[PDB]
């Protein structure tokens, strides 16, 4: 999910923006 | 320097990059 | 929810959006 | 500067990205 990808690990702008809307 | 985005810092990272679009949460 | 980006949170906001490009600081 | 624009006030993605490089 967004927590595994961006909190536990490091995510990119492209990855984070795919969680928008 | 923390490259992790957790909690209120994730929410903000999303208020920032998501713009007009909005985001869930 | 803080929409301000100050200190280590600004630095990170910049490590995030600046990507390949880099940033000063 | 980036501190007045993004810390003291609220800045957008477009504004912040203009501080890159």
mmCIF file of N, CA and C in Angstrom:
data_model
loop_
_atom_site.group_PDB
_atom_site.id
_atom_site.type_symbol
_atom_site.label_atom_id
_atom_site.label_comp_id
_atom_site.label_asym_id
_atom_site.label_seq_id
_atom_site.Cartn_x
_atom_site.Cartn_y
_atom_site.Cartn_z
ATOM 1 N N UNK A 1 0.885 -1.213 0.000
ATOM 2 C CA UNK A 1 0.000 0.000 0.000
ATOM 3 C C UNK A 1 0.897 1.230 0.000
ATOM 4 N N UNK A 2 0.321 2.425 0.174
ATOM 5 C CA UNK A 2 1.080 3.648 0.291
ATOM 6 C C UNK A 2 2.002 3.657 1.527
ATOM 7 N N UNK A 3 1.599 3.007 2.624
ATOM 8 C CA UNK A 3 2.466 2.910 3.832
ATOM 9 C C UNK A 3 3.679 2.010 3.576
ATOM 10 N N UNK A 4 3.525 0.839 2.967
ATOM 11 C CA UNK A 4 4.697 0.037 2.672
ATOM 12 C C UNK A 4 5.610 0.715 1.684
ATOM 13 N N UNK A 5 5.043 1.343 0.680
ATOM 14 C CA UNK A 5 5.840 1.934 -0.357
ATOM 15 C C UNK A 5 6.565 3.231 0.000
ATOM 16 N N UNK A 6 5.953 4.065 0.833
ATOM 17 C CA UNK A 6 6.411 5.444 1.064
ATOM 18 C C UNK A 6 6.906 5.714 2.516
ATOM 19 N N UNK A 7 6.391 4.933 3.472
ATOM 20 C CA UNK A 7 6.811 5.012 4.864
ATOM 21 C C UNK A 7 7.850 3.957 5.226
ATOM 22 N N UNK A 8 7.478 2.685 5.128
ATOM 23 C CA UNK A 8 8.439 1.621 5.454
ATOM 24 C C UNK A 8 9.664 1.725 4.505
ATOM 25 N N UNK A 9 9.412 1.920 3.209
ATOM 26 C CA UNK A 9 10.445 2.094 2.189
ATOM 27 C C UNK A 9 10.485 3.568 1.751
ATOM 28 N N UNK A 10 11.287 3.897 0.742
ATOM 29 C CA UNK A 10 11.318 5.224 0.127
ATOM 30 C C UNK A 10 10.588 5.206 -1.242
ATOM 31 N N UNK A 11 9.620 6.091 -1.440
ATOM 32 C CA UNK A 11 8.955 6.164 -2.735
ATOM 33 C C UNK A 11 9.340 7.401 -3.567
ATOM 34 N N UNK A 12 9.115 7.336 -4.880
ATOM 35 C CA UNK A 12 9.390 8.469 -5.736
ATOM 36 C C UNK A 12 8.161 9.369 -5.900
ATOM 37 N N UNK A 13 8.381 10.541 -6.480
ATOM 38 C CA UNK A 13 7.300 11.429 -6.861
ATOM 39 C C UNK A 13 6.297 10.699 -7.720
ATOM 40 N N UNK A 14 6.779 9.938 -8.690
ATOM 41 C CA UNK A 14 5.893 9.274 -9.635
ATOM 42 C C UNK A 14 4.994 8.309 -8.864
ATOM 43 N N UNK A 15 5.578 7.546 -7.931
ATOM 44 C CA UNK A 15 4.857 6.561 -7.081
ATOM 45 C C UNK A 15 3.856 7.197 -6.181
ATOM 46 N N UNK A 16 4.235 8.292 -5.549
ATOM 47 C CA UNK A 16 3.325 8.970 -4.642
ATOM 48 C C UNK A 16 2.146 9.567 -5.396
ATOM 49 N N UNK A 17 2.418 10.215 -6.520
ATOM 50 C CA UNK A 17 1.384 10.849 -7.334
ATOM 51 C C UNK A 17 0.357 9.851 -7.838
ATOM 52 N N UNK A 18 0.765 8.595 -8.001
ATOM 53 C CA UNK A 18 -0.204 7.529 -8.295
ATOM 54 C C UNK A 18 -1.133 7.114 -7.146
ATOM 55 N N UNK A 19 -1.020 7.792 -6.005
ATOM 56 C CA UNK A 19 -1.904 7.559 -4.913
ATOM 57 C C UNK A 19 -2.892 8.683 -4.872
ATOM 58 N N UNK A 20 -2.739 9.661 -5.765
ATOM 59 C CA UNK A 20 -3.624 10.816 -5.765
ATOM 60 C C UNK A 20 -4.980 10.383 -6.260
ATOM 61 N N UNK A 21 -6.037 11.084 -5.851
ATOM 62 C CA UNK A 21 -7.400 10.865 -6.358
ATOM 63 C C UNK A 21 -7.715 9.402 -6.336
ATOM 64 N N UNK B 1 18.904 13.136 7.625
ATOM 65 C CA UNK B 1 17.757 13.346 6.653
ATOM 66 C C UNK B 1 16.859 12.107 6.388
ATOM 67 N N UNK B 2 15.594 12.212 6.787
ATOM 68 C CA UNK B 2 14.635 11.132 6.645
ATOM 69 C C UNK B 2 14.002 11.180 5.301
ATOM 70 N N UNK B 3 14.118 10.101 4.537
ATOM 71 C CA UNK B 3 13.447 10.011 3.251
ATOM 72 C C UNK B 3 12.177 9.232 3.349
ATOM 73 N N UNK B 4 11.850 8.824 4.552
ATOM 74 C CA UNK B 4 10.583 8.172 4.755
ATOM 75 C C UNK B 4 9.474 9.210 4.884
ATOM 76 N N UNK B 5 8.272 8.864 4.406
ATOM 77 C CA UNK B 5 7.100 9.740 4.532
ATOM 78 C C UNK B 5 6.040 8.977 5.286
ATOM 79 N N UNK B 6 5.921 9.203 6.593
ATOM 80 C CA UNK B 6 4.986 8.483 7.448
ATOM 81 C C UNK B 6 4.082 9.422 8.197
ATOM 82 N N UNK B 7 2.859 8.986 8.471
ATOM 83 C CA UNK B 7 1.959 9.776 9.329
ATOM 84 C C UNK B 7 1.479 11.106 8.739
ATOM 85 N N UNK B 8 1.755 12.213 9.444
ATOM 86 C CA UNK B 8 1.325 13.550 9.005
ATOM 87 C C UNK B 8 2.201 14.048 7.858
ATOM 88 N N UNK B 9 3.408 13.518 7.779
ATOM 89 C CA UNK B 9 4.335 13.844 6.689
ATOM 90 C C UNK B 9 3.937 13.216 5.314
ATOM 91 N N UNK B 10 3.318 12.029 5.327
ATOM 92 C CA UNK B 10 2.730 11.426 4.137
ATOM 93 C C UNK B 10 1.520 12.213 3.639
ATOM 94 N N UNK B 11 0.589 12.498 4.554
ATOM 95 C CA UNK B 11 -0.583 13.340 4.296
ATOM 96 C C UNK B 11 -0.214 14.641 3.616
ATOM 97 N N UNK B 12 0.749 15.352 4.179
ATOM 98 C CA UNK B 12 1.282 16.541 3.546
ATOM 99 C C UNK B 12 1.968 16.294 2.219
ATOM 100 N N UNK B 13 2.718 15.208 2.077
ATOM 101 C CA UNK B 13 3.412 14.953 0.828
ATOM 102 C C UNK B 13 2.373 14.848 -0.278
ATOM 103 N N UNK B 14 1.219 14.361 0.117
ATOM 104 C CA UNK B 14 0.058 14.201 -0.738
ATOM 105 C C UNK B 14 -0.786 15.476 -0.944
ATOM 106 N N UNK B 15 -0.879 16.347 0.055
ATOM 107 C CA UNK B 15 -1.534 17.639 -0.147
ATOM 108 C C UNK B 15 -0.719 18.489 -1.128
ATOM 109 N N UNK B 16 0.593 18.281 -1.093
ATOM 110 C CA UNK B 16 1.577 18.944 -1.959
ATOM 111 C C UNK B 16 1.561 18.506 -3.451
ATOM 112 N N UNK B 17 1.715 17.200 -3.691
ATOM 113 C CA UNK B 17 1.841 16.664 -5.057
ATOM 114 C C UNK B 17 0.516 16.413 -5.766
ATOM 115 N N UNK B 18 -0.558 16.290 -5.001
ATOM 116 C CA UNK B 18 -1.863 15.969 -5.547
ATOM 117 C C UNK B 18 -2.686 17.199 -5.961
ATOM 118 N N UNK B 19 -2.391 18.378 -5.420
ATOM 119 C CA UNK B 19 -2.930 19.636 -5.966
ATOM 120 C C UNK B 19 -4.434 19.627 -6.185
ATOM 121 N N UNK B 20 -4.892 20.117 -7.348
ATOM 122 C CA UNK B 20 -6.338 20.247 -7.668
ATOM 123 C C UNK B 20 -7.131 18.938 -7.511
ATOM 124 N N UNK B 21 -6.415 17.873 -7.840
ATOM 125 C CA UNK B 21 -6.855 16.498 -7.902
ATOM 126 C C UNK B 21 -7.533 15.971 -6.645
ATOM 127 N N UNK B 22 -7.021 16.366 -5.488
ATOM 128 C CA UNK B 22 -7.309 15.863 -4.144
ATOM 129 C C UNK B 22 -6.653 14.510 -3.910
ATOM 130 N N UNK B 23 -6.893 13.938 -2.737
ATOM 131 C CA UNK B 23 -6.513 12.567 -2.444
ATOM 132 C C UNK B 23 -7.445 12.015 -1.370
ATOM 133 N N UNK B 24 -7.623 10.703 -1.364
ATOM 134 C CA UNK B 24 -8.384 10.086 -0.310
ATOM 135 C C UNK B 24 -7.632 10.245 1.016
ATOM 136 N N UNK B 25 -8.336 10.624 2.107
ATOM 137 C CA UNK B 25 -7.663 10.614 3.428
ATOM 138 C C UNK B 25 -7.098 11.971 3.854
ATOM 139 N N UNK C 1 -3.319 19.358 10.619
ATOM 140 C CA UNK C 1 -2.452 19.208 9.382
ATOM 141 C C UNK C 1 -1.641 20.465 8.967
ATOM 142 N N UNK C 2 -0.317 20.348 9.032
ATOM 143 C CA UNK C 2 0.584 21.441 8.711
ATOM 144 C C UNK C 2 0.860 21.468 7.252
ATOM 145 N N UNK C 3 0.564 22.586 6.600
ATOM 146 C CA UNK C 3 0.893 22.750 5.193
ATOM 147 C C UNK C 3 2.152 23.530 5.012
ATOM 148 N N UNK C 4 2.773 23.876 6.116
ATOM 149 C CA UNK C 4 4.055 24.525 6.030
ATOM 150 C C UNK C 4 5.154 23.489 5.822
ATOM 151 N N UNK C 5 6.200 23.868 5.078
ATOM 152 C CA UNK C 5 7.360 22.995 4.860
ATOM 153 C C UNK C 5 8.580 23.723 5.365
ATOM 154 N N UNK C 6 9.021 23.429 6.586
ATOM 155 C CA UNK C 6 10.144 24.108 7.218
ATOM 156 C C UNK C 6 11.201 23.137 7.665
ATOM 157 N N UNK C 7 12.456 23.566 7.647
ATOM 158 C CA UNK C 7 13.537 22.737 8.210
ATOM 159 C C UNK C 7 13.845 21.444 7.448
ATOM 160 N N UNK C 8 13.746 20.299 8.139
ATOM 161 C CA UNK C 8 14.044 18.990 7.536
ATOM 162 C C UNK C 8 12.905 18.548 6.619
ATOM 163 N N UNK C 9 11.721 19.074 6.873
ATOM 164 C CA UNK C 9 10.549 18.800 6.034
ATOM 165 C C UNK C 9 10.595 19.504 4.639
ATOM 166 N N UNK C 10 11.205 20.692 4.560
ATOM 167 C CA UNK C 10 11.481 21.362 3.295
ATOM 168 C C UNK C 10 12.523 20.611 2.469
ATOM 169 N N UNK C 11 13.651 20.284 3.105
ATOM 170 C CA UNK C 11 14.716 19.465 2.518
ATOM 171 C C UNK C 11 14.179 18.200 1.883
ATOM 172 N N UNK C 12 13.383 17.453 2.630
ATOM 173 C CA UNK C 12 12.701 16.296 2.087
ATOM 174 C C UNK C 12 11.706 16.609 0.989
ATOM 175 N N UNK C 13 10.952 17.696 1.098
ATOM 176 C CA UNK C 13 9.969 18.013 0.078
ATOM 177 C C UNK C 13 10.700 18.184 -1.246
ATOM 178 N N UNK C 14 11.919 18.657 -1.126
ATOM 179 C CA UNK C 14 12.830 18.871 -2.235
ATOM 180 C C UNK C 14 13.587 17.614 -2.713
ATOM 181 N N UNK C 15 13.921 16.692 -1.818
ATOM 182 C CA UNK C 15 14.496 15.416 -2.246
ATOM 183 C C UNK C 15 13.456 14.615 -3.036
ATOM 184 N N UNK C 16 12.196 14.811 -2.663
ATOM 185 C CA UNK C 16 11.022 14.189 -3.289
ATOM 186 C C UNK C 16 10.667 14.706 -4.712
ATOM 187 N N UNK C 17 10.467 16.022 -4.836
ATOM 188 C CA UNK C 17 10.008 16.629 -6.096
ATOM 189 C C UNK C 17 11.115 16.928 -7.100
ATOM 190 N N UNK C 18 12.346 17.017 -6.622
ATOM 191 C CA UNK C 18 13.475 17.375 -7.459
ATOM 192 C C UNK C 18 14.161 16.175 -8.131
ATOM 193 N N UNK C 19 14.003 14.966 -7.597
ATOM 194 C CA UNK C 19 14.379 13.743 -8.327
ATOM 195 C C UNK C 19 15.780 13.774 -8.915
ATOM 196 N N UNK C 20 15.930 13.350 -10.179
ATOM 197 C CA UNK C 20 17.249 13.248 -10.857
ATOM 198 C C UNK C 20 18.065 14.552 -10.833
ATOM 199 N N UNK C 21 17.296 15.628 -10.916
ATOM 200 C CA UNK C 21 17.717 17.007 -11.012
ATOM 201 C C UNK C 21 18.691 17.470 -9.938
ATOM 202 N N UNK C 22 18.482 17.010 -8.713
ATOM 203 C CA UNK C 22 19.101 17.443 -7.458
ATOM 204 C C UNK C 22 18.533 18.777 -6.996
ATOM 205 N N UNK C 23 19.062 19.287 -5.891
ATOM 206 C CA UNK C 23 18.777 20.638 -5.439
ATOM 207 C C UNK C 23 19.952 21.138 -4.605
ATOM 208 N N UNK C 24 20.134 22.449 -4.573
ATOM 209 C CA UNK C 24 21.139 23.014 -3.711
ATOM 210 C C UNK C 24 20.742 22.779 -2.250
ATOM 211 N N UNK C 25 21.693 22.347 -1.392
ATOM 212 C CA UNK C 25 21.371 22.282 0.054
ATOM 213 C C UNK C 25 20.921 20.900 0.534
ATOM 214 N N UNK D 1 12.319 34.217 -0.490
ATOM 215 C CA UNK D 1 13.167 33.011 -0.776
ATOM 216 C C UNK D 1 12.291 31.777 -0.617
ATOM 217 N N UNK D 2 12.884 30.579 -0.657
ATOM 218 C CA UNK D 2 12.170 29.345 -0.420
ATOM 219 C C UNK D 2 11.586 29.265 1.005
ATOM 220 N N UNK D 3 12.255 29.857 2.000
ATOM 221 C CA UNK D 3 11.718 29.884 3.390
ATOM 222 C C UNK D 3 10.486 30.788 3.493
ATOM 223 N N UNK D 4 10.491 31.991 2.929
ATOM 224 C CA UNK D 4 9.288 32.800 2.980
ATOM 225 C C UNK D 4 8.152 32.169 2.217
ATOM 226 N N UNK D 5 8.445 31.599 1.070
ATOM 227 C CA UNK D 5 7.411 31.060 0.236
ATOM 228 C C UNK D 5 6.789 29.741 0.693
ATOM 229 N N UNK D 6 7.584 28.867 1.300
ATOM 230 C CA UNK D 6 7.189 27.475 1.564
ATOM 231 C C UNK D 6 7.071 27.124 3.078
ATOM 232 N N UNK D 7 7.814 27.856 3.915
ATOM 233 C CA UNK D 7 7.756 27.700 5.362
ATOM 234 C C UNK D 7 6.847 28.727 6.027
ATOM 235 N N UNK D 8 7.191 30.005 5.908
ATOM 236 C CA UNK D 8 6.349 31.043 6.521
ATOM 237 C C UNK D 8 4.925 30.982 5.904
ATOM 238 N N UNK D 9 4.844 30.859 4.577
ATOM 239 C CA UNK D 9 3.588 30.733 3.840
ATOM 240 C C UNK D 9 3.429 29.283 3.348
ATOM 241 N N UNK D 10 2.398 29.004 2.556
ATOM 242 C CA UNK D 10 2.206 27.712 1.897
ATOM 243 C C UNK D 10 2.570 27.808 0.393
ATOM 244 N N UNK D 11 3.452 26.941 -0.089
ATOM 245 C CA UNK D 11 3.772 26.942 -1.511
ATOM 246 C C UNK D 11 3.183 25.749 -2.285
ATOM 247 N N UNK D 12 3.072 25.886 -3.607
ATOM 248 C CA UNK D 12 2.585 24.797 -4.426
ATOM 249 C C UNK D 12 3.727 23.916 -4.941
ATOM 250 N N UNK D 13 3.361 22.776 -5.509
ATOM 251 C CA UNK D 13 4.307 21.916 -6.195
ATOM 252 C C UNK D 13 5.067 22.699 -7.237
ATOM 253 N N UNK D 14 4.364 23.507 -8.014
ATOM 254 C CA UNK D 14 4.990 24.226 -9.113
ATOM 255 C C UNK D 14 6.059 25.155 -8.541
ATOM 256 N N UNK D 15 5.732 25.863 -7.452
ATOM 257 C CA UNK D 15 6.650 26.806 -6.758
ATOM 258 C C UNK D 15 7.840 26.129 -6.172
ATOM 259 N N UNK D 16 7.624 24.999 -5.525
ATOM 260 C CA UNK D 16 8.726 24.281 -4.912
ATOM 261 C C UNK D 16 9.675 23.732 -5.968
ATOM 262 N N UNK D 17 9.127 23.143 -7.021
ATOM 263 C CA UNK D 17 9.920 22.562 -8.101
ATOM 264 C C UNK D 17 10.795 23.592 -8.791
ATOM 265 N N UNK D 18 10.368 24.852 -8.780
ATOM 266 C CA UNK D 18 11.240 25.938 -9.248
ATOM 267 C C UNK D 18 12.429 26.298 -8.348
ATOM 268 N N UNK D 19 12.600 25.559 -7.253
ATOM 269 C CA UNK D 19 13.731 25.740 -6.406
ATOM 270 C C UNK D 19 14.691 24.621 -6.673
ATOM 271 N N UNK D 20 14.313 23.691 -7.551
ATOM 272 C CA UNK D 20 15.161 22.544 -7.834
ATOM 273 C C UNK D 20 16.353 23.013 -8.628
ATOM 274 N N UNK D 21 17.474 22.297 -8.535
ATOM 275 C CA UNK D 21 18.668 22.553 -9.354
ATOM 276 C C UNK D 21 18.989 24.014 -9.333
#
